[PDB]
Amino acid sequence: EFDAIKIALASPDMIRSWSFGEVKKPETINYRTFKPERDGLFCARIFGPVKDYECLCGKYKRLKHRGVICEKCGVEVTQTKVRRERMGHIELASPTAHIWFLKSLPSRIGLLLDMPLRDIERVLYFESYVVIEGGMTNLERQQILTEEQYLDALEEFGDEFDAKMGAEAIQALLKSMDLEQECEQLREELNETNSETKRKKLTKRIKLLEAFVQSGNKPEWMILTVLPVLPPDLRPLVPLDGGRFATSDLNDLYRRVINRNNRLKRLLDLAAPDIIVRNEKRMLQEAVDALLDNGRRGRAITGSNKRPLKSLADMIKGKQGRFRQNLLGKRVDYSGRSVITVGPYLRLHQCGLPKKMALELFKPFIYGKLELRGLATTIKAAKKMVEREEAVVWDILDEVIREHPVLLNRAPTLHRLGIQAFEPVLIEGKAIQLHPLVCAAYNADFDGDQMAVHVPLTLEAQLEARALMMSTNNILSPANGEPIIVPSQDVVLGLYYMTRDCVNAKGEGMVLTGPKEAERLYRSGLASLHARVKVRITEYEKDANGELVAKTSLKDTTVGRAILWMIVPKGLPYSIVNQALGKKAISKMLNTCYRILGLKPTVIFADQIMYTGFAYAARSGASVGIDDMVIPEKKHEIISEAEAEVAEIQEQFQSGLVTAGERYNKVIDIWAAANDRVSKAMMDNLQTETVINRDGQEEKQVSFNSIYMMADSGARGSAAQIRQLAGMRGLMAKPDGSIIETPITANFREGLNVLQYFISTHGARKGLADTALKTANSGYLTRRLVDVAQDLVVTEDDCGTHEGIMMTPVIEGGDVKEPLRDRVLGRVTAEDVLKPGTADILVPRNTLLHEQWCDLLEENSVDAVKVRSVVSCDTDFGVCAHCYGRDLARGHIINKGEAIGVIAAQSIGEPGTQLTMRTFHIITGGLPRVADLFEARRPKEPAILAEISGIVSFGKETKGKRRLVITPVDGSDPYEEMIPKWRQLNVFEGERVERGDVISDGPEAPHDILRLRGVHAVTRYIVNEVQDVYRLQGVKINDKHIEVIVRQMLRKATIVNAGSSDFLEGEQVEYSRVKIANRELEANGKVGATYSRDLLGITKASLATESFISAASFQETTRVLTEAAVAGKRDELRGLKENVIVGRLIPAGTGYAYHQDRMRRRAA
Amino acid sequence: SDEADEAYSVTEQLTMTGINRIRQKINAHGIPVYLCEACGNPIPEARRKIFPGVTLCVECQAYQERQRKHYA
Amino acid sequence: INKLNRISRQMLQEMGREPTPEELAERMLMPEDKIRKVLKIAKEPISMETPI
DNA sequence: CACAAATCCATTGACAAAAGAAGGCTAAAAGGGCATATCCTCGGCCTTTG
DNA sequence: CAAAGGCCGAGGAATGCGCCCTTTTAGCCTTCTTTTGTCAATGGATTTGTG
Ligand SMILES: [Mg+2]
Ligand SMILES: [Zn+2]
Ligand SMILES: [Zn+2]
Ligand SMILES: [Zn+2]
């Protein structure tokens, strides 16, 4: 409908073009009748009627009188939503400089006049006259004169002398200004001003002058003469209860302007002196300022309160502004929340919706059904039916709800799995029943959390929920393709108890005929669930071109192993269930089922796993007692020995043999060591038990202790919490991080006395205070990242580039901490992978390295594959599907369209929430280190590099820094470095060093790494560091996501050789533009311009957006809007955030086709 | 999550990082130095038997502890 | 309104707790409906940006 | 298939009411004139006082 | 020769703030003229009755 937004400076005439009438009186309503006034801010002539199709007084009260203007009040009879649309204007009696173009930092008026800000402010607030074209009389244009000086200069000069003060002075300075002429003089000086500050500011000014020329703006429009008036329904004066009214602050500021403007007209008509009229003009200036942007002058005028009034600039900016939480965060209909419960019988695709929420949300659908089937004559009769909640509204509910997903969403949507479409299953009660295997995605436990359900309304949104967000489509973490459907705690304890043998149970060494017979034997109670039997198992192995050959054999398994084999689908081997099956065993079981069989068998398998886990966990009868905390008997022996050691060390310290802090360290170490012995002793007591037996002799097997079974099945708990339960508690911290050296020699099976329970409170309160505040800013990294990587979208199928990073294993000194197959799975190869025979193309090229190719690669022991990276993609304004990879949220390759930048932001932010919130140093860690990493900050101690290649050489001695020069083997050596002798060198002056090499030691600033070595160098650096943190805590997140964030980082170019192109030299340009520019200029008979690639921290790169509707969201709205106005910018929308704001489809998801067809039209 | 389980993780990390810092400061395995690196004095036998690998006698050690107490 | 405030500020002190509008209309000369509407005249309504 | 009573259709007269349309009257809202001259704190600032 | 004190001024809460009188302006309130909706007559052109 518009396809683009334009912006400019508003002319006085255009401000009257909008207006429907000039507001003159300050009044608002009548105080008695409450009727709008004849010229007040709430008028009826200016801003339209108060009731629909009904003039103010009431002569014309028919909709048949539409559009006619009443005669007694002039109020045209229209709809009173027109009053929410019509502007008015205020005829300022004096020009008043628009505060944005004056008190903004560059001050477009100031840098456009080539005048200092204080000087304009002196002319403006009536300090000093200014020469405005003073003829030939030796007067200086824009030369300030003071009062006395203006008088005496006027002495001997009865001739014009043309000097003025006030806003009229600046208006006559701007109006007289010739913009192209100044561009010409500034080009002629830039010709011959070849010195840095002079020609620098020359060019920096000619840029704005040429821009003011192009944008159509006139320079003097920044001096308001007419002032527009926001319509009444955007600043209402509505009544509250009991004669009470509630207004906007905008009405106060508007009244202040109107009063002072009317008084100024009065003063001028009354011929008042200079002091009074000057002061009235200053007052009108400050009033208009406060109206536009209250607070830039100082101080923010306060209302009938202590707090400032809110203004227009405030009405847009700030989280209470329009952009923040009215342009994105909106309250939505057809929605509602409740308290979630388990509902463990559902399938992965459904959610128990209460009948009452379902009857409220689906109201219009139900009304339509009752009037379609004839059960309700009209919509009123259907309304009464479903209000009584009769007997057929329930059948209609079943029919309407039948295939109609509902979006379930929980409050911290860290990732896109905090929204999933489920099919509603109607239930009694008022709690939403949420599948158990979905809590991991939602981060939802059933101790009182709540969920919001929304209802898709369109067929297209029904198909987006079903096809896209349905819970049985999203089962792999989008950050890393491991399935997100891992069974959690009753399930894994069920599968562990059943799949866990003991030495002599009922029915040992029977040879069952198969899993059916083992189940029939167990359920009749003839055999126990863990009784090692020979069982005949038929497993089907797709060892073929997907042929599924069957093979039967005689395995040795427990009865539960075989009972559970009945649920496993065909393609899976039998060794998958033949072990104990803790937590990781189950996650890997689902994973291999997914890598063999796909998505439908995996969803079925997940449901069957949950069902059998819950069933055999209930049959487990796995309680928790007090006798289950087996305190080891050697605990007080170990504590006596440790107490003796601390007493001995204290005796030596008393004899001056050690210091104080030394002995503190010694005793802290003694207590940590004795705690380790107690924990080890208790776990070796707990983790095994004796039992008899076929032949009759005692035999040790793993313990069936319940606390241990829960810690060891991976179901819940771990040996540390087990240590606190039966072993000793240990040493406790303080909030400072110091360690209280009086340990907790007690456990929780015993008690703590008052002192130890006090001492533990220190660390407890510290941890809770941190977890309470981490919850506050839980999603700041995700938001920072989606600021910069938002507009990045997969827009192309293949770019064809042969660039690609060389993926290899990370060998962290010893072994590998991440193999090549893991780092390379899912990526598209960039070149042919040759066999170790060095003549056999193993994987040819553009081959999505799935698990087959990845196994082929690890098999030949090919350990350096060149893969295509998102950072080396030759695509413009996007990425292709080949340089990206596979999806990792769906097993397949990425689709053309997928908005991978937002996926990358959330895939780095959500997993980051599992990291420490405060940085800790060991290689630091925590989230703050990751944020600083992406901000690309300069480390204070940069290991200096070798900027040029050549023979090393030194120079002058200690001019602060020891000097060095590198001189090429055949080239010039104009680069020398002030190497600090503090920077203790690494290479002697007699070892010729290659370019891009270390000189000093220390942290490498990524800017220098990028400038010395390939972009691949900077990208490998960044991914290796940030993944260092993420592996430090144990969290897995792919490298694709860091790579796309980095490609958003280094997206600016700096031009060295401008070539035959049209780029200025020392200029930074969007690299995606300069690429196409040099490509085109080299297409024709020119040569391209060569640049130096840049790098910006995410908060710096996201501040450079091609649009301005988007950039006014996460930035200062005021600076962005002032700049866009003076630039005459137009936003051709082409973005995600802009199309969200303006209310159309985004170009990312299903909207990609809409935007493609629309671009077809706009190019036709 | 329960809001106390994450608190547990925070407290665990805090205490462990403190414990291991105060452990690394011990440097039990070491070299027999036999003489002070500050005053060259004879580090007495008992102090080298208690702390294998000392570098300061108790006087210079306590001195350094005062300064590193304040800072810098 | 200024006169109403003056007479009330005096009468509450001299009469005890507070002047009921019948008492003001008696002490004043008004007809006790005019006084009630004068009381009902709202005052300086509010900033709709007020916190909740 | 021929002749007189039964009944939808359109004007007349009379006219009750609804709608304005003015004229008059208050009360309400706006405007005008007024003629001795001029609090509490804090702190500089200077007169007086010793 | 300095010190106390008397004096003046530069800055803030607020227990702080018009009254009496003339003159227009709004609006309500009654009174009357006209457009409009209604009840009853009073034939007059199809509908039915008849043989
Ligand atoms: Mg909860
Ligand atoms: Zn009207
Ligand atoms: Zn590409
Ligand atoms: Zn010593």
Swiss-Prot record, chain A:
Zn(2+) 1 binds at residues 55, 57, 70, 73. Changing residue 489 to P: Resistant to antibiotics salinamide A and B. Changing residue 760 to A: Resistant to antibiotics salinamide A and B. DNA-dependent RNA polymerase (RNAP) catalyzes the transcription of DNA into RNA using the four ribonucleoside triphosphates as substrates. Resistance to the antibiotics salinamide A, salinamide B, rifampicin, streptolydigin, CBR703, myxopyronin, and lipiarmycin can result from mutations in this protein. Changing residue 765 to C: Resistant to antibiotics salinamide A and B. Pfam families: RNA_pol_Rpb1_1 (PF04997), RNA_pol_Rpb1_2 (PF00623), RNA_pol_Rpb1_3 (PF04983), RNA_pol_Rpb1_4 (PF05000), RNA_pol_Rpb1_5 (PF04998). This is DNA-directed RNA polymerase subunit beta'. Changing residue 682 to V: Resistant to antibiotics salinamide A and B. Mg(2+) binds at residues 445, 447, 449. It catalyses: RNA(n) + a ribonucleoside 5'-triphosphate = RNA(n+1) + diphosphate. GO terms for molecular function: DNA binding; DNA-directed RNA polymerase activity; magnesium ion binding; zinc ion binding. Signal peptide: none annotated. Co-administration of salinamide and rifampicin or salinamide and myxopyronin suppresses the emergence of resistance to both antibiotics. Acetylated on several lysine residues in the presence of glucose. The RNAP catalytic core consists of 2 alpha, 1 beta, 1 beta' and 1 omega subunit. When a sigma factor is associated with the core the holoenzyme is formed, which can initiate transcription. The rRNA transcription and antitermination complex (rrnTAC) consists of RNAP, NusA, NusB, NusE (rpsJ), NusG, SubB, ribosomal protein S4, DNA and precursor rRNA; S4 is more flexible than other subunits. Changing residue 743 to S/T: Resistant to antibiotics salinamide A and B. GO terms for biological process: bacterial-type flagellum assembly; bacterial-type flagellum-dependent cell motility; cell motility; cellular response to cell envelope stress; DNA-templated transcription initiation; intracellular iron ion homeostasis; nitrate assimilation; regulation of DNA-templated transcription elongation. Belongs to the RNA polymerase beta' chain family. Keywords: Acetylation, Antibiotic resistance, DNA-directed RNA polymerase, Magnesium, Metal-binding, Nucleotidyltransferase, Transcription, Transferase, Zinc. GO terms for cellular component: cytoplasm; cytosol; cytosolic DNA-directed RNA polymerase complex; membrane; transcription elongation factor complex. InterPro entries: DNA-dir_RpoC_beta_prime (IPR045867), DNA-dir_RpoC_beta_prime_bact (IPR012754), RNA_pol_asu (IPR000722), RNA_pol_N (IPR006592), RNA_pol_Rpb1_1 (IPR007080), RNA_pol_Rpb1_3 (IPR007066), RNA_pol_Rpb1_3_sf (IPR042102), RNA_pol_Rpb1_4 (IPR007083). Zn(2+) 2 binds at residues 799, 873, 880, 883. CDD domains: RNAP_beta'_C, RNAP_beta'_N. Its EC number is 2.7.7.6. Its cofactor is Mg(2+); Zn(2+).
Curated annotation (Swiss-Prot), chain B:
InterPro entries: Znf_C4-type_bac (IPR020460), Znf_C4_TraR (IPR012783), Znf_DskA_TraR (IPR000962), Znf_DskA_TraR_CS (IPR020458). Signal peptide: none annotated. A zinc finger (dksA C4-type) spans 36-60. The keyword Zinc-finger applies. GO terms for molecular function: zinc ion binding. PANTHER family: DNAK SUPPRESSOR PROTEIN (PTHR38777:SF1), FELS-2 PROPHAGE PROTEIN (PTHR38777). This is Protein TraR. Keywords: Metal-binding, Plasmid, Zinc, Zinc-finger. It comes from the Bacteria. SUPFAM superfamilies: Glucocorticoid receptor-like (DNA-binding domain). Pfam families: zf-dskA_traR.
